[model samples]
Target chain A: SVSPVEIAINPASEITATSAFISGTVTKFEQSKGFYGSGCNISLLYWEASNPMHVKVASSISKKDFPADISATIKDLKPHTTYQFKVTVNFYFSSSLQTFKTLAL
Target chain B: SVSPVEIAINPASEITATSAFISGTVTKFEQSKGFYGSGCNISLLYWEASNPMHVKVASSISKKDFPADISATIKDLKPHTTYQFKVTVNFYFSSSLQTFKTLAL
Candidate 1:
């Protein structure tokens, strides 16, 4: 069985002064055989700070609709600051997490 | 072998005068072993009128994160009117559609 694959956050080096739109795509789910299964599930988390270790920012869930490919916007961030983000893909049995960072203004 | 499961729209017959919040859940996707599959995908559509047929209204798509269960708000409706809705579940190879109607004021 293949492990659930997660997507890496793309365009990690986002511009600092303007709001940034973070996005990524998820892949590798078995198609359903009948009327009792789904495709894929993906989630995202964002934080602002230089260090990936300790940063916190507001979060929003993608509308609970599947086949996970996400494009979410984060607003009202400080200029000349660095940020980091993670995307987690889950399949209940196993999951993957990918991380990246943003550029400063 | 299970097929992709679709969720039927719940709380179908809603209030007539005030705007209504329609919701539903989806289930039955196989979990992943490592890092690459999802749980479910759900979508919702809304229309207003007497007959479920030939009704047209505004629409919104769920955000593209994953694990498909949706709750959307429809607003600024007439004092007395009927509405119809549909929910679709998709998993690449298979899809399901469910429909229902709301009451008049």
Candidate 2:
């Protein structure tokens, strides 16, 4: 069976400058139990789509400063602009991926 | 001098099961540098507030699975319930903190 996966973006959709937060809950079931790290590493990335398939402006990793919980905010952003984001979780044994988009003002 | 600190939650606020994304950017300067890591370790934690100031439901860490940028997702949560979240970053030298709350559906 496939591992359980859970991911979602708050508000599902939002305007520019508005805060965007991503949270995910995953479950892994093994036949045997052993020593393992039961946690995840979350990261946040942001970029402005200048072209139909390209990004102009981009933000550095926010996880560098914050290492607990998956949360982020976007401020002073242009109105009516498209932005793309992704969230990845490192489960030590395995990994998962999720993507999201935002609406412009 | 104090290091530059930046943190934010996407969508500003949202209902239950809504994906909440938290991202922060911090800058630290030293007089000189020789050898150091230039990335941050991010972690995500969640809990349901039972009493006025207590948590009931909680989620484990998602960073252990993925460790590149800060990101996570909240799925299958109850509506109209108060939830608390926090994000932390370990920059190999120092750390930063940021917190936010969300409204229920």
Candidate 3:
């Protein structure tokens, strides 16, 4: 069966010259022993679209959770630069790419 | 006092899923006996904004040449990816950053 997970990017907020709040959600899941019992790993991966320098943050969700929230306040971003980001589940299931621009200096 | 050279990115063209024509110009220069007589070096540097693995093409210009053009048709690019690029003179005088997106699959 296809993976029962879906990830989506929420609109970014609190964007500034060098920082922004990036967030996303994970939807649909099933709870079980072996795998789901220990929770699922998540990562917020982001990088500058001009000079890609991959940066990420790690977190996890309880087995019983669905429609879970994952987020990070990424910092030291380049002014007036576009950045791309996505959430990944267990290092394999990647969400669609989303983007935002840091404010100009 | 500032750099005597001015580098600029011409809009990119011939964009495709895996390739695109990136071009730019360098304006103003002077001929000299020691350093300028040896000509000047230029490099077209680009990288995937998502995974900054830098790739570049190198070339040179005659000392008498001003308003020189530099470009490269970058290949083996990921489809629907954003890339950042710029031209540099003598490995130091970098132009402003430019960006382009490949066609989606």
Candidate 4:
């Protein structure tokens, strides 16, 4: 049975001019009598929202890695720009929209 | 409508002792004659066959990034080990299993 789960992403302060780290905790599981999952996925999406440019990056991990608080590093990105990214667990458990900015070189 | 799409992973030589880059082209879409994808997700899963240790990571990108070769980087990994990972486009379209060795320090 599927219910609900919480996933999140970091802000621009934790990001660099080219790369950023996606960090968050499992937070909670909205399942009956707790829940067990085979695995989950972490992904990053970035675009100015004000522009037509957009890109994405991702990672995969199992259930045990949850609630442990993790920060996944992704590279090959633009610098000094407004970007939005999010993280999802299992498949449907998606987090809120997080915004960030890269440093100027 | 969803059809079948092809996805693949990289070899071990491209990985370092800690992390590796997940890269590949997001080939053609398999929908109707003229397919139109709103968005897609790229995820990764890795573990050792000899053990039960498994982990996953993911990235979210839009349709505009499709057919374009891209790579996502992940850090904080175990060094010098046999690890298997895969990339999933959308939800059902998953790439074949890819294996690689981490460079020993």
Which numbered prediction scores highest in TM-score against the true structure?
Answer: 4
Runs of candidate 4 exceeding 4 Å displacement: A1-105, B1-4, B32-37, B47-54
Q: What's model 4's lDDT at A8?
A: 53
Q: Which pairs clash inside model 3?
A: none
Q: What is the TM-score of chain B alone in each candidate?
A: 0.53, 0.44, 0.81, 0.68
Per-candidate DockQ vs. reference: 0.03, 0.02, 0.03, 0.15
Q: What tens digits encode model 2's per-residue C-alpha lDDT throughout B1-105?
A: 464334332332334445455432223322213213222334344444432121211221212122233445565555555555544433122233333445454
Off by over 4 Å in 1: A1-72, A75-105, B33-36, B49-69, B89-105
Q: Name the Cα RMSD for model 1.
A: 13.8
Instruction: Provide the lowest-lDDT 10-residue window in model 2 chain A.
Output: A53-62
- TM-scores of chain A in all candidate models: 0.56, 0.43, 0.79, 0.64
Q: A45-72 in candidate 1: lDDT tens per residue?
A: 4544443322232232322234456667
Q: What share of the true interface contacts does each candidate keep?
A: 0.00, 0.00, 0.00, 0.23
Taking the tens digit of each residue's C-alpha lDDT, what string does model 4 give over B1-105?
253465656653457778877666666555443334434555555555344222455344456444545466655667888767666665456777777767786
For residue A47, give model 4's deviation from the true position in Å: 17
Error of 2 at A56 (Å): 30
The all-Cα superposition gives candidate 2 an RMSD in Å to the true structure of 14.7
Off by over 4 Å in 2: A1-105, B4-34, B51-69, B91-105
Q: What is the TM-score of chain B in candidate 1?
A: 0.53
